[PDB]
Ligand binder design. Sequence first.
Ligand SMILES: [Zn+2]
Ligand SMILES: [Zn+2]
Ligand SMILES: [Zn+2]
Lengths: 32, 153, 60, 46, 320, 169, 85, 49, 50
Amino acid sequence: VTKHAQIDFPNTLLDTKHSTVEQTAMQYNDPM
Amino acid sequence: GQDVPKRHTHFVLESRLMYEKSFRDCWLHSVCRAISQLDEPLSKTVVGTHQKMLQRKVTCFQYNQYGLFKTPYYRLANVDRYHAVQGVAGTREWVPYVNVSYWTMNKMVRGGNLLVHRVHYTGWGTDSHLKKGGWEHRWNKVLQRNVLQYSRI
Amino acid sequence: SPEFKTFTGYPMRDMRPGYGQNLPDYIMKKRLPNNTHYELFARRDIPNEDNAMYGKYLYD
Amino acid sequence: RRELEKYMPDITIGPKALVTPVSLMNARNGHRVTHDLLHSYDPHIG
Amino acid sequence: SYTPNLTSLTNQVNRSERLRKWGSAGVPPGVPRIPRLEAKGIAILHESPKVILAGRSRCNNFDSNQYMLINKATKRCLLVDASDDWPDDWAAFIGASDLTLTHVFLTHCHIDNIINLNAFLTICGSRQKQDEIGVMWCPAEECWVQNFKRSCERYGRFEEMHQVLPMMCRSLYTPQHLVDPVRNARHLRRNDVLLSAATNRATSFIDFGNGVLLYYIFSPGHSPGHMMLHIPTERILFSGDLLFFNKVGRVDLPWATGVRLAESLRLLEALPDNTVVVPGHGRMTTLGRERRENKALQQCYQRQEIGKQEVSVGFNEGYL
Amino acid sequence: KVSKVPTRSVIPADALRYHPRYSVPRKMVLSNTFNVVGENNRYTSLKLILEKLSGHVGRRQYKMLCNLEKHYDKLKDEGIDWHELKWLSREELIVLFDKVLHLTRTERAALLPAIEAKVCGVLRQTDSRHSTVVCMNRGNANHGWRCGRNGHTNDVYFEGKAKANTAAL
Amino acid sequence: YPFLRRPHINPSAPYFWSFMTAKSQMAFLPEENYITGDWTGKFFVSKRQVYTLQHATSGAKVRVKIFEFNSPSRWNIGKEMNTLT
Amino acid sequence: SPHGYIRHFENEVRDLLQYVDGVTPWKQAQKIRTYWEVRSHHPMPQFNR
Amino acid sequence: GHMPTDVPRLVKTGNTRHNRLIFPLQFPPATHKFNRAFVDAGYQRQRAIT
RNA sequence: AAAUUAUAUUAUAUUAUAUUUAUUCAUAUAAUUAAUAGGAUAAUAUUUGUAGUUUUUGAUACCAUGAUAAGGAUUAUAAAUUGAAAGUGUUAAUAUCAUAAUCAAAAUUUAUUAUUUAUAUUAAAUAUGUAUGUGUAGAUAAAAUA
Ligand SMILES: [Zn+2]
Ligand SMILES: [Zn+2]
Ligand SMILES: [Zn+2]
């Protein structure tokens, strides 16, 4: 069993047109 | 890795042993079937009750062989050796010369191991007999090369 | 017939419906599968070719 | 087997019918025994 | 691997290891070139008002990545860790973007970083023909430059063996050739800079243009000279081989010390958590996620807290 | 923001161990010979303990002079086990050492730390299929000198396998 | 798929003895209707054993792979176990 | 050694028939019945197709 | 020899992975007259369902 | 309201309404391990259940892939030839699980009142009123309500 990583802000209604390092910083709970 | 899991190696080796048992048993089973299922007399020497007694005795000999390979060849002639995908002989899921599936043939085409020439997918390749009559004509041409060119003796 | 497309001067098939395996005269005149292509398939189609050229213990 | 032998008759020649003679070796690709497993005649496998 | 002397040839444990590792072959299969099939295109990773980061992941069978920084004002591009099995997509990208390639940054001179370097310089200079491309590197990697051929021996890279590396040619830091009085494509490379190990936050930078500064950081442990790039205005840390996703670099290679790697991880604690760390291999992460979820940094700081004077951390199985 | 690295104030020394991936190592299950406790399976824990007590010891590889491996054959010919050796009393050990084993005074001195601690002869699982790891924890009399930890409960000869089944052996 | 080469292989009055049965009556019963050698007993018999007179006469046990034939009759005599089920 | 068809095996057919007649008793070979010998016990054994 | 428990055992098989080992604690069936003498060894019952 | 992009060709379909079957599904299962070994026409080794036991089948993840649609320009000044046909550029939406600790779905085979879709069976009925699909298919040789 692997526990998925969690962020504070919801991922619903987030734009997928962001850059790759912006989504990278966004998903690891440390946004730019 | 590494090549293929060992259960598939066991399966291919059991297929090879079934082929070897076919080579072991086919002549004996064919002679027993051709004696036991004949109604005409075998010879001038053996007729009447001797022929029926000999047919019953060879039927008793044929039924007493535990493990005699009477299985036809086309039932397990679709076994692949590199991968575990099972194809069907007669369809496009199997190639007959290198004896692998369509998936394994595509991987060995894309890997560069074979020396195969690509031709247009709606033509008949290059073989004049294949362009002439199709698969049946090349089938008959392989028959004519293998058997019918020899005057039997 | 020479005016057909698949013309080969030997009769490739006998005109007999139901010339099957149960008939003993078919069994008598059939080719046995001893040293046909099946023997090459039985002794060559191995999942690793190196187990067909030697024993692995001997090479190591 | 004792209740199976009523409706099904027994034809048991014995193990002699499973071992063909030496003169029929090359007709049977070198073999003599008609077992379900193959039988090699060398002592190294045996 | 190493040179086959008399002791290595009369050893039975050597033949036992070469049987255990590689089976009946005994020779290691090399690291081949990626073919034209199963090769992806160049992705634009980041777009900013200052710079543009364009990269390609898994460009080698070493599973390394290739990145290029583009200055939006000066139209100057900068490759970091130039190792791509196909540097023809990059030259076409530079020519179709109307860019000028002026320098190539090198973190360290392992074979997963400088394998296609002469191919990069030759193809990009040939496109510039229709000032040459400089190389930025640390001189400690000189000891890894001389073993570029031996590393090309063991990993099967035979066509890149007989190639004089551009870092070995005569720069402005070297004496000049005294040619006969009766040429300069290979005799002198004026565009070459040697980075110093005394890296500070004041003057250890490269003026990329438009007020963008790239601070190179000296961080050994995976190599004797290992230079990260840090862009504080863009929060981008090209780590190279020091830090990856949930793992750090190897120490089980020559000239690699675990306590140097531990000091290199300890000199990274003053950066903010939203700094996107960009490794030479694998997927990119952030420094805060590596402070929270990386076990090598946890072991390093735990050994530092319990009182180890020589904290030694490092991987033994991973990326070269 | 600068996140601190999560450490601990009190950490056991087992967590200071090295892994090349800094991860948990693989624990492969033992081979199929250890599925049933038999006479071939009984004395493999006794063999490895006498093997370690005679080999080299420490970082400087100090060779143990007394060879306790010569007494392994006479111990298994009597049918006594390593777990059965811990059940013997003090008077039953003087009879076993002097009469049967003929253990000398220095060979008795190298074997007694293994009997004083009552080492549990349970083969631990390891990254390989062939395991040479015996649990060196001190056993307790309530759990049959098996130390009662990680599932070694009063009949467990091997980690990951069944109990002793003393009605058979 | 080829013709009648599937590896996984009905009442009729004028085609009773000729549908899923042997072509000739001169041929003998198959191998499962006789005992080959030394047997410890079979759990089930094959589907190609011909129901004979002694199946309905003796009636010890008929186990077909399951199927239990406990209603003996003479309308099954001369026919294999395929059409009887 | 003969090869191919069964017509080329003259001595092998003779040796096989001699061996089959040698090992097999007649009291075993009596029990094997044909299809019509079993079908004779049916109440309606014979009709035209 | 397993003891019945309701707390899972967590066996860490790696970083961010573990293994949850708990067992569902089987209950005995009802003792009414229809469950008694059930033909479990047969698996092909033909007794009529009232 | 023009230029024609348009393929076009013909056939079929259902609980009429019940029955048998090819696959699907249910519930009963069998199958298990590892390694070599040279023999006639050869100047002399008698030899092979022997050297193997704690043997191998054990890392399915959140990387930056790639497919879809759309718009551009160049060449015919010849009546000869079997044959006047070929190369080169930009935007939207969708999408991206390969450096990690396992294990038999349909790895995979076989069978039973039972679940389907198909397989062929398969019929009465003029007292009144009556019963229009999407698709599935084979080779491809008509054309102007916008
Ligand atoms: Zn490196
Ligand atoms: Zn690297
Ligand atoms: Zn223990």
